[PDB]
From a paper:
The genus Enterovirus within the Picornaviridae, a family of non-enveloped viruses with a positive single-stranded RNA genome, is comprised of more than 100 serotypes. Human enteroviruses (EV) are presently classified into four groups, Enterovirus A-D (EV-A, B, C, and D), among which EV-B, the largest group, consists of over 60 serotypes, including all 6 serotypes of coxsackievirus B (CVB1-6), coxsackievirus A9 (CVA9), over 30 serotypes of echoviruses and more than 20 newly identified enteroviruses. The capsid proteins (VP1, VP2, and VP3) adopt the classical eight-stranded anti-parallel β-barrel configuration with the N-termini residing inside and the C-termini exposed on the surface. Most of the uncoating receptors bind to the “canyon” sites of the viral particle, dislodging the “pocket factor” in VP1 and subsequently triggering conformational changes of the intact particle to release the genome, albeit that SCARB2 binds EV71 outside the canyon.
Here we report the structural characterizations of E30 E-particle, A-particle and mature virion, among which E-particle and mature virion are compact with fully ordered epitopes, showing the potential to be ideal vaccine candidates. Two fundamental configurations in EVs, the compact form, generally ~160S mature virions (termed “F-particles”) and the expanded state with altered antigenic properties, e.g. ~135S uncoating intermediates (termed “A-particles”) are well documented. Compared to F- and E-particles, the E30 A-particle is markedly expanded with a ~4.5% increase in radius with a maximum diameter of ~345 Å along the fivefold axis. The expansion of the A-particle reflects tectonic movements in the particle, forming perforations at the icosahedral two-fold axes, accompanied by a ~5.5° counterclockwise rotation of the protomeric unit near the threefold axis and a ~7 Å shift away from the two-fold axis of the protomer unit. However, a close examination of the particles reveals that the F-particle differs significantly from the A-particle (RMSD = 1.1 Å in Cα atoms) at the VP1 N-terminus, VP3 GH loop and the A2B loop and C-terminus of VP2. These conformational changes of individual capsid proteins relay a cascade of alterations, separating the α helices of adjacent VP2 subunits and leading to large perforations at the two-fold axes in the A-particle, through which the viral RNA and VP4 might exit. Like most enteroviruses, E30 F-particle possesses the hydrophobic pocket in VP1 harboring a pocket factor, whereas both E- and A-particles lack hydrophobic pocket and harbor no pocket factor.
Residue numbers in the entry:
A (entry chain A), F (entry chain A): 44 to 284
B (entry chain B): 12 to 258
C (entry chain C): 1 to 233
D (entry chain A): 99 to 195
E (entry chain C): 1 to 60
G (entry chain C): 1 to 179
Write the structure that this text describes.
């Protein structure tokens, strides 16, 4: 019973609203998964975690972004934070509700380097406090570039003429995102996962570019292995009269 | 049939129609003279540095893969334009690019003349950073290859991926022009200043890369000329730099 | 206060919601936008640009520029086929990685008209005729130059024009699967046939090259946006 | 076509055309274990609607749960029941029973 | 904000409710309807048609 | 890839809204962290805790305040109250939800001196009752000075001419803040932390003052160790032609 | 009642919120404000005041008034440099603790124009000429009085004016790090 593609005659109405930049880019996409714990297990998993806000780590979002040279949007961030206990011997406890702190650190703001750091109490660092069981928390970031648009591609250097790091620019600093528990402890350890969802609002685009053929090897380069321009067939002509 | 254009010195010649292609429908122009309060004041070249700069011609043989030039870095040792690039810190400019192919009626082939803004290239040896002299020399034409590159300090010069990891046949949303020797021999592309900021450092940032890629290869009798020179003539128009004085 | 009731779907996160958000950064002046050239407000403007079709996509021709070069050779037999492919730009291997094909790949249901341009890149003294046949979405691939002439066709004279442009209707393919193996299609075809030969004077080579171009027209309607199957991270 | 009382009321007409309002009553219970003494955080459920043309998951931890074109609903237990709304989703002009 | 109070019957699902629903699929153009013949807006139009009565309903 | 400061030409728009007194002072800053427990462990940690409302204990807020001689604002106080259990042997319990009482004591009102004190039931002492798991509680304090403005600096005495305490005035009394659990007991002890956040609204300032060079030694004095006026370099002139 | 739905971000505390607050103390008459002199509504009014620059910030000159005193000595060689510093008031050690520098330090991105005033505090019968050179943000420190004269400069004659005021454009430095 599957599968066929068909012609299927259509009345003349000519929809184009799903091909606008707002309907193309403005979808809620999961961009990062943050893992942190109530108590520290190892260097990897610690009371707190971080993420520099980039748009080059999810490839399905990155390819839709990199179809244009210059973008400009507002960010709507929302967090799906769930918690679970570690594999302990006993789990019998009476815990108070866990409160989470998601801190947005702007470009120019101080980042925490440990738990109990002074950067969690900075008034210029906007934080969100949310108890488990409620509606998911949501922040809104405006256009945060020093220049007039974000640049998905930078044919240039960052050092003394011709020196530094190729392709890197500080005109794409959107900030950092820091996650921790506000509670001091629990009876037994509790691991938390914070799914970060981006929704670009009021998107404007400039200078459209060719879609990427090769896969991605790094999240900060445009490096690639060479690839065929398309798939292969057996003949340039057709048979079966 | 022919027309002579002079910009200070010297005069070049061109045809009466020539199919000029403005970049994105935007003619290059100045910053509209809203330069008040004397905190970010700009400065013109004299006026002007607006003259024709002709580069060294390349030889399009039957196995040529293509060439590229990165701007404004391909005009670095070029007269007053090349001195304003080191006397000023920030600068903006637009360009008129002429690409002429001096072929005969007995030569065949097709060229694609592209202007790619922010043509960020990848490395041949991935995980390695490349030298800046393997991206752009002072006025030299850096050329593509037919095979993939295994250079440990250079870019990926396979022409069917165009150095940027894309399909080379899709390089037509950029400002482009076809040179079919059966029909044409010239190409005029007028590129404005496209950036995310109104001014930038000229030694550090390549604004756009001009690419000349042969799509139908050059083919001829063995008794004809075998090299078919291609001349690129660039005139920088409406250049502007930062103010170097007080108050 | 105001008596309220909480309807179902209250403390939920639907990813397609369009609610107002609390600004994490108020008191902040956004950098104003300037006139950057080349603003695009719709992805049909990208699909409305001619891009080169890799018609010669054999192996190992896909890793060269030879994929774009359609070979024109001196012919022994009269009325042979030059090339041919199916007219679905979302599934056919010669059209799915073109400019039109990437955008089409992003959407599940689309309908409109294609625009094929064939460019002859031989010598200026080469003269010949080609027969570019069109097959409707029913059936089917013709078997000869006479069967191709008895349907919709365009006789492209090389000695008169260097280019040949023809607009093809009835392109709408809807796929209900994410990746297709291989999802039988009923699209049309385009085939080219040697009407006479390519006639050359002396000291001109006998081989030449046809370039192909494809785009859409200003009526093309996409719908039901998905993620493309060209990324497999 | 799986609930017969709805199917017979639908199949009284050849061609239908409607919008769908889906709502979910999600309850949870523990298995018959030996001990049940725990301190659990609130369970969050994900109901994903996959459109025609979208990728379906074939396991847990699949990439299709993070697809931005697949609308999902996240709902914690103890709140109001979650609710989606589907429009008329046929390629043709009406559904055909 | 606006001072509110949650009346009884607040976080409930009554199956006869007629509340507005959050659209799971916005940004989507619905296929337009055409003139299909034989539109019916009320089931009394089906009952207003003569149908044959099985009066001789014995076995077999 | 880091780090450079650059000139980066800017179009003429001349923003100044982030330099107003409302945008400078009006940020939600953490001013106090209150620790109290369900049961008493020691004199330090007791069923209840207190804080006299001062604006001289967080130095980043204090230096932004002390740039002006006379301030006048309304206070928006909000509380992030989390709870955790002590390190007991067993934690298996079935607890009801904890209710907290945050009492604001005005200047002139009676302060509690123990648990079960009569001052927790005073009708002129506004209290806030909040159960755990809900939205964070929030109070609003108006301008509470007897004089016409708060004074960050007082060149004077508080006693008989020339006697008393130097620099202290009763024209900065904003009141006290008392925290306790309304619940009588739990099965096992539960420690609570109440983070206090201040947001000055409708701020007016007078007589701007020089920014402080030295660090702070006390929260009630302007005492200082002497310091250099700036950092040191090697030469008054420049090299590298 | 009114049918409502609770959107995400409902029972949260965002520290940048601007919601109406319940008054803990109503029924209270606030003391009215009077005309106190010197009301300031913007911190650019503090940065628009001339403050003295510690140009002579060597050791142990930073713990004295000698940091503010630029020495003018009798010269053996012609065309020597008097002083010199970089024109970034947020990072340079001679300007980061001035009035302009504290305010600039508080903000990450700033752009505008500085205003340098040089005051000669010698005798009334002292006569001399100084050459105050300006270097653009590209490059660079000149190496001689002739190289300084061949760029933007102001010849300050001591015998004519006691003060010299010059306005400098292109001051905008953006730092993406805290320290």
């Amino acid at each position: 019973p599957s599968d066929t593609m068909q012609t299927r005659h259509v009345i003349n109405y000519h929809t184009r609203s799903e091909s606008s930049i707002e309907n193309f880019m403005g979808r809620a996409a999961c961009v990062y998964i943050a893992q942190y714990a109530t108590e520290k297990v190892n260097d990897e998993l610690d009371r707190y975690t971080n993420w520099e806000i980039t748009t080059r780590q999810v490839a399905q979002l990155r390819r839709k972004l990199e179809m244009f040279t210059y973008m400009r949007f507002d960010l709507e961030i929302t967090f799906v934070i769930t918690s679970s206990q570690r594999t302990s011997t006993t789990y019998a406890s009476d815990s108070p509700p866990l409160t989470h702190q998601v801190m947005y650190v702007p470009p120019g703001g101080p980042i925490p380097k440990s738990y109990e750091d002074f950067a969690w109490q900075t008034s210029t660092n906007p934080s969100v406090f949310w108890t488990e069981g409620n509606a998911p928390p949501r922040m809104s970031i405006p256009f945060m570039s020093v220049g007039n648009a974000y640049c998905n591609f930078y044919d240039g250097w960052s050092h003394f003429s011709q020196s530094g790091v190729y392709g890197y620019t500080t005109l794409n600093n959107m900030g950092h995102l820091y996650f921790r528990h506000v509670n001091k402890s629990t009876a037994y350890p509790v691991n938390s996962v914070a799914r970060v969802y981006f929704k670009p609002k009021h998107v404007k685009a400039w200078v459209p570019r060719a879609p990427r053929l090769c896969p991605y090897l790094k999240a900060r380069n445009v490096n690639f292995n060479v690839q065929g321009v398309t798939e292969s067939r057996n003949k340039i002509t057709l048979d079966r009269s | 049939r022919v027309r002579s254009i002079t910009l200070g010195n010297s005069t070049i010649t061109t045809q009466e129609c020539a199919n000029v292609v403005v970049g994105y429908g935007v003619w290059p122009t100045y910053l509209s003279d809203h330069e008040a309060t004397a905190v970010d004041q700009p400065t013109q070249p004299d006026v002007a540095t607006c003259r024709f700069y002709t580069l060294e011609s390349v030889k399009w043989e039957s196995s040529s893969a293509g060439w590229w030039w990165k701007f404004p870095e391909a005009l670095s040792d070029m007269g007053l334009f090349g001195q304003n690039m080191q006397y000023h810190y920030l600068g903006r400019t637009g360009y008129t690019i002429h690409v002429q192919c001096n072929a005969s009626k007995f030569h065949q082939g097709c060229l694609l003349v592209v202007c790619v803004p922010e043509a960020e290239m990848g490395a041949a040896t991935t995980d390695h950073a490349f030298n800046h002299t393997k991206l752009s020399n002072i006025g030299q034409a850096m050329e593509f290859s037919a095979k993939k590159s295994t250079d440990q300090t250079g870019p990926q010069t396979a022409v069917h991926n165009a150095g940027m990891g894309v399909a080379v046949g899709n390089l037509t949303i950029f400002p482009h022009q076809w040179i079919n020797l059966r029909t044409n021999n010239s190409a005029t592309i007028v590129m404005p200043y496209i950036n995310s900021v109104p001014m930038d450092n000229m030694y550090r940032h390549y604004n756009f890369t001009l690419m000349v890629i042969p799509f139908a290869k050059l083919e001829h009798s063995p008794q004809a000329s075998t090299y078919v020179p291609i001349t690129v003539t660039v005139a920088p128009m409406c250049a502007e730099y930062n103010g170097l004085r007080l108050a | 206060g105001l008596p309220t009731m909480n309807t179902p779907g209250s403390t939920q996160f639907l990813t397609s919601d369009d609610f107002q958000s609390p600004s994490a950064m108020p008191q902040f002046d956004v950098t104003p936008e300037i006139q950057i050239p080349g603003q695009v407000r719709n992805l049909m403007e990208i699909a409305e640009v001619d891009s080169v079709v890799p018609v010669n996509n054999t192996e190992g021709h896909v890793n060269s520029m030879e994929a774009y070069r359609i070979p024109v050779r001196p012919q022994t037999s009269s009325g042979e086929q030059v090339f041919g492919f199916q007219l679905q730009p979302g599934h056919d291997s010669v059209l799915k990685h073109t400019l039109l094909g990437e955008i089409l790949n992003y959407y599940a249901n689309w309908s409109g008209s294609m625009k094929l341009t064939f460019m002859y890149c031989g010598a200026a003294m080469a003269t010949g005729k080609f027969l570019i046949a069109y097959s409707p979405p029913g059936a089917g691939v013709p078997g000869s130059r006479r069967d191709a002439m008895l349907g919709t066709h365009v006789i492209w004279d090389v000695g008169l024009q260097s280019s040949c442009v023809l607009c093809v209707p009835w392109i709408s393919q809807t796929n209900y699967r994410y990746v297709t193996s291989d999802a039988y299609t009923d699209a049309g075809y385009i085939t080219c046939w040697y009407q006479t030969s390519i006639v050359t004077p002396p000291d001109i080579p006998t081989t030449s090259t046809i370039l192909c171009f494809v785009s859409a027209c200003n009526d093309f309607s996409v719908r039901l946006l998905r993620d493309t199957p060209f990324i497999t991270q």
